[PDB]
Design a protein around this motif. Structure first.
Motif, short mmCIF file in Angstrom:
data_model
loop_
_atom_site.label_atom_id
_atom_site.label_comp_id
_atom_site.label_asym_id
_atom_site.label_seq_id
_atom_site.Cartn_x
_atom_site.Cartn_y
_atom_site.Cartn_z
N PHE A 175 0.86 -1.18 0.00
CA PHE A 175 0.00 0.00 0.00
C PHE A 175 0.90 1.23 0.00
O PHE A 175 2.04 1.15 0.44
N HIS A 176 0.41 2.36 -0.49
CA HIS A 176 1.18 3.61 -0.36
C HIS A 176 0.40 4.69 0.40
O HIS A 176 -0.83 4.67 0.43
N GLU A 177 1.12 5.62 1.01
CA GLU A 177 0.47 6.68 1.75
C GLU A 177 -0.09 7.73 0.79
O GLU A 177 0.66 8.32 0.02
N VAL A 178 -1.40 7.97 0.83
CA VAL A 178 -2.00 8.96 -0.06
C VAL A 178 -2.36 10.25 0.67
O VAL A 178 -2.64 11.28 0.04
N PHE A 179 -2.33 10.22 2.00
CA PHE A 179 -2.66 11.39 2.82
C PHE A 179 -2.16 11.21 4.25
O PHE A 179 -2.25 10.12 4.82
N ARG A 180 -1.62 12.29 4.81
CA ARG A 180 -1.20 12.27 6.21
C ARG A 180 -1.70 13.48 6.98
O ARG A 180 -1.80 14.58 6.42
N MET A 181 -2.01 13.28 8.25
CA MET A 181 -2.44 14.37 9.11
C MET A 181 -1.72 14.23 10.43
O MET A 181 -2.00 13.29 11.18
N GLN A 182 -0.81 15.15 10.73
CA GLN A 182 -0.06 15.07 11.98
C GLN A 182 -0.91 15.53 13.16
O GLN A 182 -1.60 16.54 13.08
N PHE A 183 -0.83 14.79 14.27
CA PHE A 183 -1.55 15.15 15.48
C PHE A 183 -1.16 16.53 15.98
O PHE A 183 -1.99 17.28 16.51
N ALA A 184 0.12 16.88 15.83
CA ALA A 184 0.61 18.18 16.27
C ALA A 184 -0.05 19.33 15.50
O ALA A 184 -0.07 20.47 15.97
N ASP A 185 -0.60 19.02 14.33
CA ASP A 185 -1.22 20.03 13.48
C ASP A 185 -2.74 20.07 13.65
O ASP A 185 -3.41 20.92 13.08
N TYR A 186 -3.28 19.13 14.42
CA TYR A 186 -4.72 19.02 14.54
C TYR A 186 -5.21 19.85 15.73
O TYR A 186 -5.13 19.42 16.88
N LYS A 187 -5.73 21.04 15.43
CA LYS A 187 -6.13 22.01 16.45
C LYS A 187 -7.47 22.65 16.10
O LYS A 187 -7.52 23.83 15.76
N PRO A 188 -8.55 21.87 16.18
CA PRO A 188 -9.89 22.30 15.76
C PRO A 188 -10.41 23.52 16.52
O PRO A 188 -11.13 24.35 15.95
N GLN A 189 -10.06 23.63 17.79
CA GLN A 189 -10.42 24.82 18.55
C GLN A 189 -9.17 25.56 19.03
O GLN A 189 -9.20 26.22 20.06
N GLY A 190 -8.09 25.46 18.26
CA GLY A 190 -6.87 26.18 18.56
C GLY A 190 -5.89 25.45 19.46
O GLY A 190 -4.77 25.91 19.66
N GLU A 191 -6.31 24.31 20.00
CA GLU A 191 -5.46 23.55 20.91
C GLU A 191 -5.24 22.13 20.40
O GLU A 191 -6.11 21.56 19.76
N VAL A 192 -4.08 21.57 20.70
CA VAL A 192 -3.82 20.17 20.40
C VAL A 192 -4.80 19.29 21.18
O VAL A 192 -5.06 19.52 22.36
N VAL A 205 -3.49 7.76 5.69
CA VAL A 205 -4.39 7.02 4.80
C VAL A 205 -3.55 6.26 3.77
O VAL A 205 -2.77 6.86 3.02
N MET A 206 -3.69 4.94 3.75
CA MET A 206 -2.92 4.08 2.86
C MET A 206 -3.85 3.55 1.78
O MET A 206 -5.03 3.33 2.05
#
Length: 210
Positions: A175-192, A205-206
């Motif tokens: 499988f190959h990686e088609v999308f990545r989302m880092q937890f450090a970048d996930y801040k829906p209300q401004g906070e990790v 996402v593979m």
């Protein structure tokens, strides 16, 4: 030392029992949140079964020693508003996980990558009993899904990974990686919201086109 078989409707309780033992508590997001086991999580995890494309590995005792739960994804119609799983969730911790899943869907659309496809197989949960690891079960469960795909005109197998370990297995299987989302970048209300232990640093996402 095992067989690969379609998971039947009768198998729901046995699947749950297996996930409670080997899967739920080792998942990085569940661990980070100190979630544990809860009814909302069990119901969500079992959602795919009636699609009739999930597979189990079974030992000589007839015990489930591995599962790969899959669901069917149909390309959404022109006029589609995606459902938000988190909207219908009352469990505060689990809701955080569903919110992240909703966010991933709004940031990445696998169907735009593959315009020629109307149906994609979605690999949701892969888990193997520790006592039976290292014997190729994940590969055999995946090869079985390929057989299902060929029978149903499916060409893409899509697997969202919340654990680096799951993603690592899928990469080995081609499988190959088609999308990545880092937890450090996930801040829906401004906070990790999520900061799991290394090496689990993001959603991956593979995909594989067979």
């Amino acid at each position: 030392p095992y067989t690969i078989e379609l998971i039947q409707p009768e198998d729901g309780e046995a699947v749950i029992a297996m996930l409670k033992t080997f899967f739920f508590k080792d998942e990085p997001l569940n661990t980070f949140l100190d979630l544990g086991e809860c009814k909302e999580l069990e119901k969500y995890s079992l959602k795919p079964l009636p699609d009739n494309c999930s597979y189990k590995a079974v030992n000589k005792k007839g015990e489930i020693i591995g599962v790969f739960l899959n669901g069917l994804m149909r390309r959404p119609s022109p006029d589609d508003v995606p459902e938000k799983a988190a909207d219908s969730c009352e469990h505060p911790k689990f809701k955080k996980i569903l919110s992240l899943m909703d966010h991933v869907e709004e940031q990445f659309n696998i169907f735009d990558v593959y315009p020629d496809e109307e149906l994609i197989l979605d690999g949701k949960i892969l888990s193997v009993d520790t006592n039976y690891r290292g014997l190729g079960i994940a590969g055999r469960l995946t090869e079985r899904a390929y057989e299902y795909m060929r029978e149903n005109g499916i060409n893409v197998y899509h697997v969202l990974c919340s654990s680096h370990y799951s993603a690592r297995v899928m990469e080995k299987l081609g499988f190959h990686e088609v999308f990545r989302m880092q937890f450090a970048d996930y801040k829906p209300q401004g906070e990790v919201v999520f900061k799991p232990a290394a090496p689990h640093v993001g959603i991956q996402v593979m995909a594989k086109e067979v």
